[PDB]
Design a protein around this nucleic acid. Structure first.
Lengths: 37, 63, 102, 77, 46, 93
RNA sequence: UAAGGUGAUAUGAACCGUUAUAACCGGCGAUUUCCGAAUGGGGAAACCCAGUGUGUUUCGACACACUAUCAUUAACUGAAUCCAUAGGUUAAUGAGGCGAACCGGGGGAACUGAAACAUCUAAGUACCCCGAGGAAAAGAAAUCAACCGAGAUUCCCCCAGUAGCGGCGAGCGAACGGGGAGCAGCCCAGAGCCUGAAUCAGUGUGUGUGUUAGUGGAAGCGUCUGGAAAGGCGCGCGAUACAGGGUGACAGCCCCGUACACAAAAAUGCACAUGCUGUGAGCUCGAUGAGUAGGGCGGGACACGUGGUAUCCUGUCUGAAUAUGGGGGGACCAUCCUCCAAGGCUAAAUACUCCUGACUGACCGAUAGUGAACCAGUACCGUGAGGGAAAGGCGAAAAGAAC
RNA sequence: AGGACCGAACCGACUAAUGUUGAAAAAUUAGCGGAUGACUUGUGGCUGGGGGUGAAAGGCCAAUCAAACCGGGAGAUAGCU
RNA sequence: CGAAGGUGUGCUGUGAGGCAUGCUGGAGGUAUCAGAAGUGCGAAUGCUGACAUAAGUAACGAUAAAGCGGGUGAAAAGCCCGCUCGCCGGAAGACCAAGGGUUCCUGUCCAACGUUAAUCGGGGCAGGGUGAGUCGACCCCUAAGGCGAGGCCGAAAGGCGUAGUCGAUGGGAAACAGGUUAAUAUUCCUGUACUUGGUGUUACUGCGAAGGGGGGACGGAGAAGGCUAUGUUGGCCGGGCG
RNA sequence: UACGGUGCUGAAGCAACAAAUGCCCUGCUUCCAGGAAAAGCCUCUAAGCAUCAGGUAACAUCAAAUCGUACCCCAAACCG
């Protein structure tokens, strides 16, 4: 359980996805930034 | 029994070789694994005794 | 070699049995000895449903250290240290203090 | 590989320097040509990959002495 | 959805197996580092 | 022929179970654990010459070892080989 | 060596042994499946499939041995072609692969610094590759010095952050000379005289010493607290031994040891001596390293970035003199001094620690010290290269809790 | 006959709603396009990092792509927090 | 006759601090004066472990659906048996390949795992279980492609490649019906078969290749024709007359 | 009948019609986009061997080794 918890905390450490906050969290930040311009 | 095996001929260590394997070794594996054979040390002493006969047989034959 | 050995009579120097004599039952390669009637522990063991079931509190002897015993002289009647001399190619033990071969 | 079989000339390395002195790596190559040498003592043509000064040293030392050197150092011709 | 690891034993071995690490200079250096690090399984064989 | 030194090392134990038992008491076959590298000619010859019976045919499977564990320490057992030795009409053992 | 043993978790069962053929320790042997350079062919490592020969008193099937490639040498064969070479077959010898650092060589960055950046730096570093040894490399002046002299190479302390080099920026940075460690010189290019003359190398033997098992090894009791004494108190003894560890709390005298004195059937390392084989001393005379030195062009190494730049190395084109000669002495010339290139060998001082032993620490003590005190390069993660944990402590003794 | 027509398997992904600490690190449901072809699919193979491949989007190259991943130079450098 | 540590109290110094002592603890501590520092943490979206908070809150993973009786049990919505009800039925059935690797079957246990309970389980523990001349692999042959003696090439490592040698996803010999185990079956058993090699005898006889020829040997679409699997209906047979 | 089943016995076992995307069919027709290889298999001989060896046919006899075989496999067992 401890090994699975360390690896499953280590899941989104090297991500790329920009529309999702922290790799996973859905948001509207594309529209927020885009409307700020 | 180490000098005793050392003082025979090659033919006679082949005889007691085949009798260590034949009479002793096989009948004690069959007797051991079929619930019989209270005396388990016989397996060990037979096995080492075949090691002695093959040792002296290699030493007697040639080098 | 070993100073205290198997069929030998010793006295106990330290603890719970200080001054009690007794014969060495066996001698364990931990550097301990079991000496009869000496280090009595009150084990209590379970009556296993296999071969015979004693149950109860069995009073065994425990292993004391080899350094906690010394062999009993019986010519002086006290504890005595052991040395090793050679006599006729035999490495014999001997009592110190009267120098007697055991 | 580009080794003269007589003189043993490997390609060496160096720099293209420019007017601004920018160092760049380059290789200097030997003038290796594959020439076919008549040996009179054996009555044969032995073809070698010589430099263009392996031919100078063959013209001076003679082809027999050179082949004795290649056979001496285990260079197979 | 079709994930990346679609297993095949024959491609596992032809690709990353021992006879294929030993087949070249750099795979032998791989095995040398796995032995030197001291590793229970060197390649992936079985 | 097969040498007798080889031919003694092949048979290893009689196999006791209920499939083995019904094979004996119903279809003449004795089931026995053999050497892992023992071929069917070796098992046939070794039952011909070590229990002095007449063997009709041998069928050999290989049984795979089970991954057990002690405490939190795993381990595979060990593969063995099992020979279904079909005897002829005249047999005892 | 031995009275106890059959490795651990891990108890049992079945036994072996007690004065010597239990067990344990060491020397030398024997066996040493399969994979792996893997080597008979193949292959998805630990598997599949052979060929050849020898033998097998049921030789309708078994057992054993050999069969890889390459290099070198030899034998027998052998084209286009006559001779012959290429090639082919067989045999003998050697190699191949792994390994932590040190060493030599072939290649060789960039981030960075220059408060940007391109010359420069980083740096001939990282890394890749080849090769070798217990060390390697270098080495016996075509070297300095300076009108006096020194005398091979290597390493250390100065010289000296000096002279110099330097977008004369950032930076790079000597030598001469001095003090030490260590010290060793030789051979071929070549004939005669003369022989085994020193020399080493390979081996036998003998001696000495060391390694691989070991042996002996001093000297204490009473009483109080206490679960227990090695502690307190009192009185003794050892010490070439009060290094250390254990023992129920803190032991010189309880145990193992320590100081000290001894021990090897066998295998070995080193050093002398000696037998044989190979090898050559020494004398006279002669020779005394040519596509080489030097040059032109391009590049590199020298602290030295082409600059007034000596010197070394060479990719390319050339090209001498050869002891009435030639190289160097920091452009260059003359005078003077010094040395003999274009062949080679050479110990010691030196560098390093995969590995073994002993000892030591104003090093750590379980979030520290190794990633790893514990079955850790494990679990686990990743296709893979690779990444990579956490987790010690009952008690003096399991007496580990019968009922 | 047909890069023919309608339409299942099969390949795809146009719209909407849900979902958005999901049942799911891209789906479900209802409709939707192709559906004998420049189709689709299984098994094996080949191409590799300034390189591949690209009916071209800077797309894709192991949930990573205006230059992959791992290890190293490496404690890069950081007049900034 | 009780150290360090832990936890209280009392006294004391301007402060960091010091001193004494009760209880826990159970074996170490160290004056003074010097010496050396991994020498003092509340912050670094610090690192590691522990524990809160929201909070007994959202959720408990397809809206295919359950109801009752009986059994076992300490306990039954969930397990077993029965009767009903619903769902899939070109699949939510059956058989494999790939992949996994004992999950299979039986007995036994309910700690943890199972988003609840569990007597149940793909969970724990033990035992059992996989039978081949004909199925598949190995094997013979090859495609793409790999490797490659020599060889050509390349600073080195190495690139390419001839002979060759490997490489299926392709070509190549042969078994079917019935029965059986809790668990295997074209493998076991019953019946009836077939294939390829070795050896021996007998009769006839020209055999012989990393060589020649054939064959293997192979496209898309379409169209019918002849069949069969299979199904439907009648006949037959057994049973029912509700 | 350890109610789980276990043995024994066992009638008819036909015809018509419909009918595949399976088989004849690796066929047939057609079309351009023109559709693997090598072995087994059958044949021909060369070098050689030639009253031998080998080939063919019948019969008999021996052999056919080794490894896989459970179980899931559109899934609670594979990749997620």
């Amino acid at each position: 359980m401890d090994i699975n918890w360390r690896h499953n905390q280590s899941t989104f450490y090297h991500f790329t996805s920009d529309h999702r906050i922290s790799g996973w969290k859905e948001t509207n930040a594309m529209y927020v930034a885009l409307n700020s311009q | 029994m180490k000098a005793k095996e050392l003082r025979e001929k090659s033919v006679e260590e082949l005889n007691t070789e085949l009798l260590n394997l034949l009479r002793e070794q096989f009948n004690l594996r069959m007797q051991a694994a079929s619930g019989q054979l209270q005396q388990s040390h016989l397996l060990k002493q037979v096995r080492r005794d075949v090691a002695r006969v093959k040792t002296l047989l290699n030493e007697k034959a040639g080098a | 070699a070993a100073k205290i050995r198997r069929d030998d009579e010793v006295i106990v120097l330290t603890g719970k049995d200080k001054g009690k004599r007794g014969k060495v039952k066996n001698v364990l390669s931990s550097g301990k000895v079991i000496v009869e009637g000496i280090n009595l522990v009150k084990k209590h063991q379970k009556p296993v449903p296999a071969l015979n079931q004693p149950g109860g509190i069995v009073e065994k002897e425990a292993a004391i250290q080899v350094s906690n015993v010394a062999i009993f002289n019986a010519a002086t009647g006290k504890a005595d240290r052991v040395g090793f001399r050679f006599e006729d190619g035999k490495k014999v033990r001997f009592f110190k203090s009267n120098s007697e071969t055991i | 590989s580009r080794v003269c079989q007589v003189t043993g000339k490997r390609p060496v390395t160096g720099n293209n320097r420019s007017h601004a002195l920018n160092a760049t790596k380059r290789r200097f190559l030997p003038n290796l040509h594959s020439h076919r040498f008549w040996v009179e003592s054996e009555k044969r043509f032995v073809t070698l990959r010589v430099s263009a000064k392996g031919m100078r040293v063959i013209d001076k030392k003679g082809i027999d002495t050179v082949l004795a050197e290649l056979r001496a150092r285990g260079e197979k011709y | 959805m079709k994930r990346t690891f679609q297993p095949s034993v024959l491609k596992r071995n032809r690709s990353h197996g021992f006879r294929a690490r030993m087949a070249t200079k750099n795979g032998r250096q791989v095995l040398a580092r796995r032995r030197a690090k001291g590793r229970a399984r060197l390649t992936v064989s079985k | 022929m097969i040498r007798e030194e080889r031919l003694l090392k092949v048979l290893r134990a009689p196999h006791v179970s209920e499939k083995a038992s019904t094979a004996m008491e119903k279809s003449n076959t004795i089931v026995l654990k053999v050497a892992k590298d023992a071929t069917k000619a070796e098992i046939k010859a070794a039952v011909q010459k070590l229990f002095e019976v007449e063997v009709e045919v041998v069928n050999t499977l290989v049984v795979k070892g089970k991954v057990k564990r002690h405490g939190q320490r795993i381990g595979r057992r060990s593969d063995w080989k099992k020979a279904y030795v079909t005897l002829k009409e005249g047999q005892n053992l």
